[PDB]
């Protein structure tokens, strides 16, 4: 009895508005036992008493210590590692790379009391998928600090003894205090005998059976490792196109899309993919309705998402109320390449081919085509936008040599690719990206990002050499460009604690300032890493190599929505990059973070919270999560459906994109009740779309619709 | 009034011109009425009416008069059509000289340019003298429609025809024998041309339509075995895509793929099931089809852990997640499975991954399979599921009945009676149509040089066109050599497929017009009256095929992988056949197999296999033959396609109507299955054997499961390797009753 009361007293230390009486009462313990107490505390998590999220977490942590060690106090780090290596749960390279004395020293870095800083949802995620445990019985073998210290130890294991343990302590401190947020594959895998860490894959399909086959094989290999897939299939020629003469005739893109879909789902009882194609593709009107609920199974491919690729010329046809001409890529020499790489050349070829009567083509009204796209985007939420000209005029890569011609599953990755002619084709290029994030809630000031960038960039860069590559074309891209994708979490909390909001423009200057610091320090870190270990082999293919920086090539319309000046010495950085190079071709990308950000109780990525308390279902109960410091900042927060429209948020995304190397998983959101007759007008959908383009937004991800066309009014619009 | 001639000029209407061409086409025909053809035409003579439209009206009228009482309208209409085609291609009835025709077509890019390299102008003059263009007048109307539809070189976006049938035949012959020495080349060309143009040898569609054109795509029959790995699954899928793009039929062995829930690497992961991979194979099959096209049969063992889920994949019920409806399936069975049924016992289902050695033994070693099977049944540590054999077999035959397209492969029969040593090159699957039986090996990559994809080149002897079995000696020589040359002639898009073809040089030569053949000999399917004749017939076929391939071996060398055959051991099909066949025939061997046995062991065979009995539903139409070994459905067959209603009458209905035995006049399947068993005694590969049932022959209009099972067991008893279609006419189980059965 009192043994339980003492643990409750212990877990409630330093908490406000929590009642041990209530936990006892709710648990019905008087009528294993500790698990019931944990759940009762978690069920008391609310707006009025958010601190229950820490009471329940600490009870849970206490329980896991006993479960793993038979006592609250963890064993010595060395004794733990030895035991786990023998059990085959840790990688045996740990005992070969580090001596017993070094494990003793690393143990002195460890602060096990930091386990008491997790929220309840954080502990459940750790227990659920991160902590090393028994496959079947679910018996946990470790605690959170052992995870953190060994992730740091593995990633910096090859560092010289002069600096190695110093880096290990730095990184361990950074992650265990939630300054740096690591993705799920790293949190679960690094320190274990696995080498599978790639979570997102970008594959470009060529217009041939061999490439379609290779692409399919590559998809299968990577979905079996539960990686998200980005597929460029826009090159595949249209239905009816001649083949060799034609000695045969093309039976269409859709049967090949269907084959890609069964590849994606081949290891699902699941697999997720986004497929990309140009808006002017001859089959586009058929491709746009592929997810539509009503139709024949023969002309539907519903279990993939799609990204429609658009440039300025397309939008211009819309604004002028003119036609868009559709072509098969096979019938228009140079057009596909120019679409991504050279806009004035695209316009030259496009108008030329439009006037050529010998070329198979179809004409549709731009209003009609755009409306069909946004109609399907609204009903599914899963028809995405890629502004391919923005992705190449404002890019780390020289589009003449390494154009960006697609994205990933979640539309934040922007990397070069090359089609494979065989699954083992050494001339192909499959884009991979290693991810992480800065927790904007946990940093005290922006200059703290200097060392954090050094730690984050070096840790991920070492992972590139550490991880394995199931496909040669994937290794080539990774070793060649060493592309990283570091983003942010807790942005909403960050804005709230600074008294700014999403929708009114109050955060425009702060956002400019914040993401200037992020990119500057990321670049500086990668530049210093290049001095020490050498620039990435294909650095010469970047705009950085030419002394071109993101501050040179951003969408100039940003100047009209923010006057925050640059605070860092970009001109000195410019010279140093041009001279010493970068270890990594890309550093930044703003991913969604709905899972990994739970560890630090962060708001998800750059998104506003839906509510003050989020309710999720889990393996063994319901998980409640309260936004950071609700107690003091509830009025400061701006919830998603409290925003009047998308303008404010889109302006912020544009401001971020000024500095981001890759792209951003930008959402659009609509509340039907905010409109007459409960219907979002097509005019509004198009306007926001145009707004996004105006401020340099590269991609549009989810369209969220809350569950509970005058072309003259767009004529004055300046793209 | 005026008609408009073909050259655009006008001319006064002259009905005598219509009468003349009808008179020409009716020459030698019986019971045809030119008056009736004229009356049936009701030609609406308006000013400017084209003679070409007049002629098409008259063709259709003649075609509409085709009936069992007046079958010769088949030929009246055909000759009128041939006439029409001569005009479209040549601007006159008489074809140009062969050399001038060939030069013109090569210039137009319609014929292969190698023709002009391999033969001089003089040699083309010589070949022209071989040609008899009047042989075009021997086609039936259905035949001409096939020629016009898919065989004659043409520009289909224009529609115009470029050649005639005898140019097709002569140049197929010229191309296939082009590499022969001048001492014998033109002699082979003439003999082969005569064989095909007089319908002695029937060639498959890829050859008829393609050989003489610039293409090298002729493979229409592909067998791919999938390994239990992502790499092989990917390779298999890629191989499927490549070959369906060439419109080949696919046989897929996916039986090795481990069951849903199976551990992987420990397991570090767990298997999500066969069905998602099957779905992937299906989209591969359909990848080059407008969303008809892309055809595959997928094979798996009866004892597979997921078999009950697999058997219902074509079922119209159920969610889309557990259905793969656009492929066919072949259930693999052996003696032990049937035995469990007879004794009313259980069958144990295993994932192939959980039973080391079982999968291989299933095909190659029945004794070892039985040892392993019972051992693993008694091992409680091995994941398994037990099901009543009655339940499992009933489910299978139920889905076979409802779809017609759940097939059976008796894998023990395929390996105990086989041209291949199962310890070296076992047969572990079949093809789309269940007559092919060849070795395979999984690929770990689409370009894997160590895998083996099975290919087969097909043809058939026309049993209705031969006058005695001894004619097969020369016909086998011609057929074997022509196909063997095609092996070196055609392309191979996948290395593993070239390996099998060059290594084994496997052929599949079958028959057409079997029903007509039985009728003219006064025999029938159902009463056993055809047993001895069938024995005599297929002994002659296999003997002469073997003799030809053996002589070809002496001349050009045995196939590289000949030592993997049972033939190389000195073993013949007459040594290994199902012994129960001794009870249903007493026809003695008429040919010297012992001398052949010695000759084969010394000089080998050019080809690892020679014979296989395919359906041949299209190629039979060319020679107006009854389809393969199947009995006719009726005296008159009808295809209501294209121009209108296309009718075809069985050969010589006039004299043999009472001699024919129609499919639905059969008391059952036993007579047919005995004949198949007798055929299989000599056939290298297998036979596309059909089962047939008329619900109205049974009480309450239901075909009893007891009967489905009895026929299944009867097939096995007489060594039948496979079962293809179950046909059900369109207009509960007692194991004690089955216990009597002797497998
Ligand atoms: N038989 C087919 N049926 C339907 N589509 C096909 C077929 N063959 C190829 N395709 C598709 C796949 C590709 O998208 C495209 C071209 O395929 P490919 O393998 O490159 O043919 P090819 O290279 O021999 O001819 P081409 O020079 O026209 O590309 O057409
Ligand atoms: N003057 C005519 N009056 C009525 N029918 C005719 C006449 N001339 C030809 N026909 C019929 C006979 C045939 O059934 C049909 C086509 O015969 P056909 O000889 O090919 O016509 P055609 O004379 O225009 O061709 P061609 O110039 O090659 O001789 O038209
Ligand atoms: N991630 C996955 N999800 C579902 N099925 C998978 C997955 N990976 C592989 N499979 C299937 C495909 C094969 O049928 C089978 C084994 O594939 P395979 O490529 O041979 O794995 P493996 O060789 O690394 O492990 P193992 O030694 O168990 O075969 O499991
Ligand atoms: Cl679908
Ligand atoms: Cl600009
Ligand atoms: Cl995440
Ligand atoms: Cl289906
Ligand atoms: Cl026997
Ligand atoms: Cl056929
Ligand atoms: Mg090509
Ligand atoms: Mg005439
Ligand atoms: Mg394996
Ligand atoms: Na593939």
Numbering used by the authors:
A (entry chain B): 19 to 49, 57 to 294, 299 to 737, 1365 to 1375
B (entry chain A): 5 to 295, 298 to 737, 1364 to 1375
Authors' description from the paper:
We, therefore, sought a different crystal form for α2 in which the β-hairpin region of the cone domain is less restricted by lattice contacts. With this in mind, we were able to obtain a new crystal form of α2 by fusing the 35 C-terminal residues of β (341–375) to the C terminus of an 8-residue truncated α (α2–βC35). The overall structure of this crystal form with dATP bound at 2.10-Å resolution is essentially identical to that observed above for free α2; however, the cone domain is slightly less restricted by lattice contacts near the β-hairpin. With the restraints of the crystal lattice relaxed, helix 2 adopts the unwound conformation, as in the α4β4 complex. The hydrophobic pocket vacated by H46 is left unfilled in this structure, and residues 19–27 (helix 1) and 35–43 (helix 2) that interact with β2 in the α4β4 complex are exposed to solvent. This structure thus demonstrates that specific contacts with β2 are not required for helix 2 to be unwound and this structure reveals a connection between dATP binding in site 1 and helix 2 unwinding.
Class Ia ribonucleotide reductases (RNRs) are allosterically regulated by ATP and dATP to maintain the appropriate deoxyribonucleotide levels inside the cell for DNA biosynthesis and repair. The α2 subunit houses the active site and the allosteric sites, and the β2 subunit houses the di-iron-tyrosyl radical cofactor.3−6 On every round of turnover, these subunits come together to form an active α2β2 complex, which allows for the transfer of the radical species from β to α, affording ribonucleoside diphosphate reduction. Excess dATP inhibits RNR through the creation of an α–β interface that restricts the ability of β2 to obtain a position that is capable of radical transfer. ATP breaks the α–β interface, freeing β2 and restoring enzyme activity.
